[PDB]
Every structure is written in structure tokens, then in C-alpha cells.
Design a protein around this motif. Structure first.
Motif, PDB file in Angstrom:
ATOM      1  N   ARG A 200       0.822  -1.205   0.000  1.00 37.31           N
ATOM      2  CA  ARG A 200       0.000   0.000   0.000  1.00 37.31           C
ATOM      3  C   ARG A 200       0.859   1.260   0.000  1.00 37.31           C
ATOM      4  NH1 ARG A 200      -4.619   1.369   4.643  1.00 37.31           N
ATOM      5  NH2 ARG A 200      -5.237   3.424   3.809  1.00 37.31           N
ATOM      6  N   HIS A 201       1.909   1.283   0.822  1.00 32.91           N
ATOM      7  CA  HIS A 201       2.776   2.452   0.892  1.00 32.91           C
ATOM      8  C   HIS A 201       3.624   2.600  -0.364  1.00 32.91           C
ATOM      9  CE1 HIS A 201       5.116   5.613   2.778  1.00 32.91           C
ATOM     10  NE2 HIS A 201       6.220   4.963   2.458  1.00 32.91           N
ATOM     11  N   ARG A 202       4.007   1.479  -0.983  1.00 32.35           N
ATOM     12  CA  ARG A 202       4.619   1.536  -2.308  1.00 32.35           C
ATOM     13  C   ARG A 202       3.649   2.121  -3.333  1.00 32.35           C
ATOM     14  NH1 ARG A 202       6.271  -3.395  -0.028  1.00 32.35           N
ATOM     15  NH2 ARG A 202       8.540  -3.609   0.205  1.00 32.35           N
ATOM     16  N   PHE A 203       2.363   1.778  -3.208  1.00 26.61           N
ATOM     17  CA  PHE A 203       1.342   2.333  -4.093  1.00 26.61           C
ATOM     18  C   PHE A 203       1.163   3.828  -3.856  1.00 26.61           C
ATOM     19  CE2 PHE A 203      -0.827  -2.086  -4.128  1.00 26.61           C
ATOM     20  CZ  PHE A 203       0.134  -2.545  -5.018  1.00 26.61           C
ATOM     21  N   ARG A 204       1.251   4.267  -2.595  1.00 25.78           N
ATOM     22  CA  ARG A 204       1.171   5.697  -2.297  1.00 25.78           C
ATOM     23  C   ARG A 204       2.379   6.458  -2.827  1.00 25.78           C
ATOM     24  NH1 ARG A 204      -2.981   3.756  -1.140  1.00 25.78           N
ATOM     25  NH2 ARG A 204      -4.533   4.499   0.371  1.00 25.78           N
ATOM     26  N   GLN A 205       3.580   5.877  -2.736  1.00 27.26           N
ATOM     27  CA  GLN A 205       4.744   6.616  -3.219  1.00 27.26           C
ATOM     28  C   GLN A 205       4.763   6.670  -4.745  1.00 27.26           C
ATOM     29  OE1 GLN A 205       8.329   4.867  -1.616  1.00 27.26           O
ATOM     30  NE2 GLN A 205       8.223   3.007  -2.865  1.00 27.26           N
ATOM     31  N   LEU A 206       4.269   5.624  -5.421  1.00 25.49           N
ATOM     32  CA  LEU A 206       4.150   5.743  -6.873  1.00 25.49           C
ATOM     33  C   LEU A 206       2.982   6.643  -7.269  1.00 25.49           C
ATOM     34  CD1 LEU A 206       1.706   3.521  -8.134  1.00 25.49           C
ATOM     35  CD2 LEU A 206       3.518   1.927  -7.478  1.00 25.49           C
ATOM     36  N   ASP A 207       1.950   6.739  -6.425  1.00 21.08           N
ATOM     37  CA  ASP A 207       0.873   7.700  -6.648  1.00 21.08           C
ATOM     38  C   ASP A 207       1.391   9.129  -6.566  1.00 21.08           C
ATOM     39  OD1 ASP A 207      -2.239   8.013  -6.782  1.00 21.08           O
ATOM     40  OD2 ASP A 207      -1.647   9.315  -5.116  1.00 21.08           O
ATOM     41  N   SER A 208       2.264   9.393  -5.590  1.00 27.41           N
ATOM     42  CA  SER A 208       2.904  10.699  -5.474  1.00 27.41           C
ATOM     43  C   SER A 208       3.830  10.972  -6.654  1.00 27.41           C
ATOM     44  CB  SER A 208       3.674  10.782  -4.157  1.00 27.41           C
ATOM     45  OG  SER A 208       4.350  12.021  -4.034  1.00 27.41           O
ATOM     46  N   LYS A 209       4.536   9.940  -7.131  1.00 26.45           N
ATOM     47  CA  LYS A 209       5.390  10.105  -8.306  1.00 26.45           C
ATOM     48  C   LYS A 209       4.572  10.421  -9.556  1.00 26.45           C
ATOM     49  CE  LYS A 209       9.274   7.246  -6.811  1.00 26.45           C
ATOM     50  NZ  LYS A 209      10.093   6.047  -7.106  1.00 26.45           N
ATOM     51  N   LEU A 210       3.423   9.761  -9.717  1.00 24.84           N
ATOM     52  CA  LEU A 210       2.558  10.041 -10.861  1.00 24.84           C
ATOM     53  C   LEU A 210       1.949  11.434 -10.774  1.00 24.84           C
ATOM     54  CD1 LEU A 210       0.805   6.597 -11.341  1.00 24.84           C
ATOM     55  CD2 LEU A 210       2.526   7.697 -12.800  1.00 24.84           C
ATOM     56  N   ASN A 211       1.642  11.891  -9.555  1.00 27.64           N
ATOM     57  CA  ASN A 211       1.186  13.266  -9.377  1.00 27.64           C
ATOM     58  C   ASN A 211       2.276  14.258  -9.754  1.00 27.64           C
ATOM     59  OD1 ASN A 211      -1.472  12.720  -8.411  1.00 27.64           O
ATOM     60  ND2 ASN A 211      -0.611  12.196  -6.408  1.00 27.64           N
ATOM     61  N   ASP A 212       3.530  13.934  -9.431  1.00 32.04           N
ATOM     62  CA  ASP A 212       4.644  14.807  -9.793  1.00 32.04           C
ATOM     63  C   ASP A 212       4.851  14.838 -11.304  1.00 32.04           C
ATOM     64  OD1 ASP A 212       5.113  15.433  -7.114  1.00 32.04           O
ATOM     65  OD2 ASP A 212       6.480  13.735  -6.852  1.00 32.04           O
ATOM     66  N   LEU A 213       4.673  13.685 -11.958  1.00 35.10           N
ATOM     67  CA  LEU A 213       4.776  13.623 -13.414  1.00 35.10           C
ATOM     68  C   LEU A 213       3.679  14.439 -14.082  1.00 35.10           C
ATOM     69  CD1 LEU A 213       5.679   9.854 -14.009  1.00 35.10           C
ATOM     70  CD2 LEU A 213       7.205  11.836 -13.981  1.00 35.10           C
ATOM     71  N   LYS A 214       2.452  14.356 -13.559  1.00 34.46           N
ATOM     72  CA  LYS A 214       1.350  15.138 -14.112  1.00 34.46           C
ATOM     73  C   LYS A 214       1.566  16.630 -13.876  1.00 34.46           C
ATOM     74  CE  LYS A 214      -2.776  15.050 -12.184  1.00 34.46           C
ATOM     75  NZ  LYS A 214      -3.166  16.485 -12.092  1.00 34.46           N
ATOM     76  N   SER A 215       2.180  16.977 -12.740  1.00 33.49           N
ATOM     77  CA  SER A 215       2.506  18.372 -12.452  1.00 33.49           C
ATOM     78  C   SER A 215       3.532  18.915 -13.439  1.00 33.49           C
ATOM     79  CB  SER A 215       3.028  18.491 -11.021  1.00 33.49           C
ATOM     80  OG  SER A 215       2.046  18.084 -10.083  1.00 33.49           O
ATOM     81  N   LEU A 216       4.566  18.122 -13.733  1.00 34.61           N
ATOM     82  CA  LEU A 216       5.587  18.558 -14.683  1.00 34.61           C
ATOM     83  C   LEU A 216       5.036  18.627 -16.104  1.00 34.61           C
ATOM     84  CD1 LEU A 216       8.698  16.714 -13.256  1.00 34.61           C
ATOM     85  CD2 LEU A 216       8.126  19.146 -13.136  1.00 34.61           C
ATOM     86  N   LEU A 217       4.108  17.728 -16.443  1.00 40.05           N
ATOM     87  CA  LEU A 217       3.486  17.782 -17.762  1.00 40.05           C
ATOM     88  C   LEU A 217       2.593  19.007 -17.913  1.00 40.05           C
ATOM     89  CD1 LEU A 217       2.697  14.059 -18.492  1.00 40.05           C
ATOM     90  CD2 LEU A 217       4.419  15.522 -19.554  1.00 40.05           C
ATOM     91  N   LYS A 218       1.854  19.372 -16.860  1.00 34.53           N
ATOM     92  CA  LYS A 218       1.050  20.590 -16.920  1.00 34.53           C
ATOM     93  C   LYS A 218       1.934  21.828 -16.986  1.00 34.53           C
ATOM     94  CE  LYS A 218      -2.669  20.937 -14.442  1.00 34.53           C
ATOM     95  NZ  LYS A 218      -3.595  20.922 -13.279  1.00 34.53           N
ATOM     96  N   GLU A 219       3.090  21.783 -16.313  1.00 35.93           N
ATOM     97  CA  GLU A 219       4.050  22.880 -16.390  1.00 35.93           C
ATOM     98  C   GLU A 219       4.590  23.060 -17.806  1.00 35.93           C
ATOM     99  OE1 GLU A 219       7.333  22.360 -13.786  1.00 35.93           O
ATOM    100  OE2 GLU A 219       8.323  24.228 -14.364  1.00 35.93           O
ATOM    101  N   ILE A 220       4.928  21.959 -18.480  1.00 29.83           N
ATOM    102  CA  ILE A 220       5.439  22.059 -19.848  1.00 29.83           C
ATOM    103  C   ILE A 220       4.325  22.459 -20.818  1.00 29.83           C
ATOM    104  CG2 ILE A 220       6.565  20.719 -21.702  1.00 29.83           C
ATOM    105  CD1 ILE A 220       8.377  21.629 -19.458  1.00 29.83           C
ATOM    106  N   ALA A 221       3.099  21.982 -20.568  1.00 28.51           N
ATOM    107  CA  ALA A 221       1.953  22.349 -21.398  1.00 28.51           C
ATOM    108  C   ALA A 221       1.614  23.830 -21.270  1.00 28.51           C
ATOM    109  CB  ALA A 221       0.741  21.497 -21.021  1.00 28.51           C
ATOM    110  N   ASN A 222       1.880  24.419 -20.108  1.00 26.65           N
ATOM    111  CA  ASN A 222       1.724  25.855 -19.951  1.00 26.65           C
ATOM    112  C   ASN A 222       2.924  26.633 -20.483  1.00 26.65           C
ATOM    113  OD1 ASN A 222       0.529  28.262 -19.239  1.00 26.65           O
ATOM    114  ND2 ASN A 222       0.768  27.996 -17.023  1.00 26.65           N
ATOM    115  N   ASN A 223       4.130  26.058 -20.437  1.00 23.86           N
ATOM    116  CA  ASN A 223       5.312  26.764 -20.926  1.00 23.86           C
ATOM    117  C   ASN A 223       5.317  26.870 -22.446  1.00 23.86           C
ATOM    118  OD1 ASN A 223       6.721  27.460 -18.505  1.00 23.86           O
ATOM    119  ND2 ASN A 223       7.307  25.306 -18.266  1.00 23.86           N
ATOM    120  N   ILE A 224       4.784  25.854 -23.133  1.00 26.21           N
ATOM    121  CA  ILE A 224       4.726  25.901 -24.594  1.00 26.21           C
ATOM    122  C   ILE A 224       3.741  26.967 -25.062  1.00 26.21           C
ATOM    123  CG2 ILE A 224       4.118  24.572 -26.660  1.00 26.21           C
ATOM    124  CD1 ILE A 224       6.836  23.934 -25.534  1.00 26.21           C
ATOM    125  N   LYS A 225       2.573  27.034 -24.436  1.00 27.30           N
ATOM    126  CA  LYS A 225       1.576  28.028 -24.818  1.00 27.30           C
ATOM    127  C   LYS A 225       1.624  29.248 -23.908  1.00 27.30           C
ATOM    128  CE  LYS A 225      -1.593  24.724 -26.906  1.00 27.30           C
ATOM    129  NZ  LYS A 225      -2.960  24.142 -26.853  1.00 27.30           N
TER     130      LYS A 225
END
Lengths: 34, 34
Positions: free
Chosen positions: A9-34
């Protein structure tokens, strides 16, 4: 009293946090391009 | 009657939805560049 649902479960939470960080960086790049 | 296959299953479904959202945003950026 021992279980392994919390540790996987805690491994699932830490990969959940990693996926949230990936989505955050993708939204950052999607805003930087436009 | 208690199980934990459904709760970890539902965690798997919500990360499946998150991965679908990531693939959607990647296809959006791949179309925005070209």
C-alpha cells in the motif's frame, strides 16, 4: 501481528505521489509551450 | 465477509485512469508541436 498490505500500500502511495509529480511537470510544460 | 482485492483493485483502476490522463496530455502536446 504482521501484514504486508500496508507495505505494498505504501509503495502504491509513493508511486501515486510520483505520478502526481509527473502530471505536475506535464502541466508545467503544457503551460510553458503556450 | 471481508477482502482487500477490491480496494487494491480500485487503486489500480484510479492509477489506470491517471495513466490514461497522462497519455491524453502527451497526445495533446504531440499534436500541439506539429
Amino acid at each position: 501481528a504482521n501484514d504486508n498490505s500496508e507495505e505494498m500500500r505504501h509503495r502504491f502511495r509513493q508511486l501515486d505521489s510520483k505520478l502526481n509529480d509527473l502530471k505536475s511537470l506535464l502541466k508545467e510544460i503544457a503551460n510553458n509551450i503556450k
